[PDB]
Design a protein around this ligand. Structure first.
Ligand code: EPU
Ligand code: MG
Ligand code: MG
Length: 463
């Protein structure tokens, strides 16, 4: 891995970002001087600063002093003072994915793309390669829990990276192996409502593979299977489908572990214990197993990693067990924010929780999304046994009338399967929970916004 010519200091605008911070950590550990700004100081920025990155909170033209190159998050606005000034001083300004691509350039890149499951799959592959003693570099879009970080620099040529389709930015990447987990409507503003344009973009992405490259694609996704003829690279499939190259059979969930068999292309049978719940994770783990098997990694390494898998951050993220005045409860944090993904989480919980109650704390992310998927939210949220609603996490959006938490609560109440409690002052969340808790409750803190931080504050106080 060569040093980049004349690159002394790399400045990140929005350095606390999930993807931004991983790249900064890689480059810091490679020996580059790292600076960055963010509007918020948290665990991520504190870790980077402690490691030796120069972090500023707030944006100012002075923050870019000394930068050889500026890396910008998609979250950053065009009026940002650091961004405007960087261009004025003729300092290269590049997107996050272009810098990830440079990390990938001289590495054996395994890019994990798809709508859902990318963070878990990337973590799984990372852990398999680690267990195989291959000492991979990885850059994930969320925590690899066993690592306690989103990214890690290994001494090998291997790179496992989550590949973001959301701005077509994964087109910068030049991988050796590309996983596509699935394809569903998301980030449609970048694709202008056109599902076909997204389809074309994924095909374009797979065309970045070398002629000898490998695409590992989910056999259970009809859209992905229709795209196989257009790939023009070797395609290996995985899933429950009888036509899958790596076929999952005999799946059972016991508690929060999965048990199943994978039948490989040469009919080799592999009995898997997977340390995370749900058929959806069996799929993610079979993408990971397929990648590893195709790379030549021994079953021992694959099985050990999957059996010990500690999960990805906020993906059915077990926060612990707590004795409360009204019962012993289990708290779990999950990122799921689309109705189908919230449904998957509820299913995984149900299949591990027997006859005990599932209590959900749900925070809708965006008024726009709440508006657009309102009825679907009403239906999926109505599946839980007790429901606490938090106010919509606006993420910069102006309120939309009829698309707030009060409106969701009304509609759910009126459906009559569950009677939701709206909690606006989240300092009261623990008290509301304490009032309604029963022994053996599973409490699912659900959503993409501040709900995770709120749930961890709750956990901490309950310790
Ligand atoms: C788009 C997704 O989310 C992720 C994706 O998972 C990962 C990995 O691929 O790369 C991107 O993270 P990222 O590291 O660029 O940024 P995010 O994790 O969204 O956070 C943005 C960061 O910018 C900061 N920020 C935002 C606005 C601002 O004016 N100033 C500022 O400093 C925020 O405080 C935050 O710390 C994607 N986010 C965006 C906005 O592009 C997705 O997965 O669908
Ligand atoms: Mg996404
Ligand atoms: Mg019910």
């Amino acid at each position: 891995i060569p040093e980049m010519r004349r690159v002394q200091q790399i400045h990140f605008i929005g350095i606390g970002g999930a993807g931004m911070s991983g790249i900064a950590e890689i480059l810091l550990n490679e020996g580059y001087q790292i600076s960055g700004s963010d509007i918020a100081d948290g665990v991520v920025t504190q870790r980077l600063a402690q490691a030796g990155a120069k972090i500023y909170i707030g944006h100012a033209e002075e923050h870019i002093e000394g930068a050889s190159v500026v890396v910008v998050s998609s979250a950053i606005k065009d009026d940002n003072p650091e961004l405007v000034t960087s261009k004025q001083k003729r300092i290269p300004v590049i997107q996050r994915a272009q810098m990830l691509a440079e990390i990938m350039r001289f590495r054996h890149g395994i890019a994990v793309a798809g709508t859902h499951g990318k963070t878990t799959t990337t973590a799984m592959i990372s852990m398999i390669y680690t267990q195989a003693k291959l000492d991979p570099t990885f850059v994930n879009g969320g925590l690899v829990k066993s690592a306690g970080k989103n990214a890690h620099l290994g001494a090998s040529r291997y790179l496992i990276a989550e590949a973001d389709e959301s701005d077509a930015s994964f087109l910068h990447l030049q991988p050796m192996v590309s996983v596509v987990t699935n394809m569903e409507p998301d980030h449609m503003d970048t694709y202008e409502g056109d599902f076909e344009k997204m389809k074309a973009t994924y095909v374009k992405f797979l065309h970045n593979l070398p002629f000898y490259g490998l695409a590992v694609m989910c056999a259970d996704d009809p859209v992905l299977m229709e795209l196989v003829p257009k790939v023009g690279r070797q395609v290996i499939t995985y899933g429950f489908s009888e036509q899958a190259d790596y076929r999952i059979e005999d799946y059972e969930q016991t508690g929060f572990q999965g048990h199943y068999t994978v039948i490989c292309p040469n009919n080799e049978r592999i009995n898997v214990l997977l340390n995370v719940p749900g058929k959806h994770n069996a799929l993610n783990a079979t993408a990971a197993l397929a990648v590893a098997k195709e790379e030549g990694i021994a079953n021992e390494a694959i099985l050990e990693a999957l059996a010990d898998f500690q999960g990805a951050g906020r993906r059915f993220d077990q926060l612990g067990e707590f004795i409360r005045p009204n019962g012993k409860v289990r708290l779990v944090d999950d990122y799921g924010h689309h109705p189908t993904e919230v449904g998957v989480t509820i299913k995984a919980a149900r299949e591990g929780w027997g006859d005990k109650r599932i209590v959900m704390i749900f925070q809708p992310h965006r008024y726009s999304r709440t508006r657009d998927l309102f009825d679907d939210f009403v239906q999926v949220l109505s599946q839980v046994d007790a429901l606490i609603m938090l106010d919509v996490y606006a993420a910069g959006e102006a309120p939309i009338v009829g698309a707030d938490s009060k409106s969701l609560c009304r509609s759910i109440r009126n459906l009559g399967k569950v009677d939701p409690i709206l909690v606006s002052d989240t300092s009261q969340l623990g008290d509301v929970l304490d009032q309604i808790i029963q022994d053996g409750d599973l409490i699912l803190a659900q959503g993409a916004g501040s709900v995770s931080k709120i749930s961890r504050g709750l956990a901490e106080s309950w310790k």
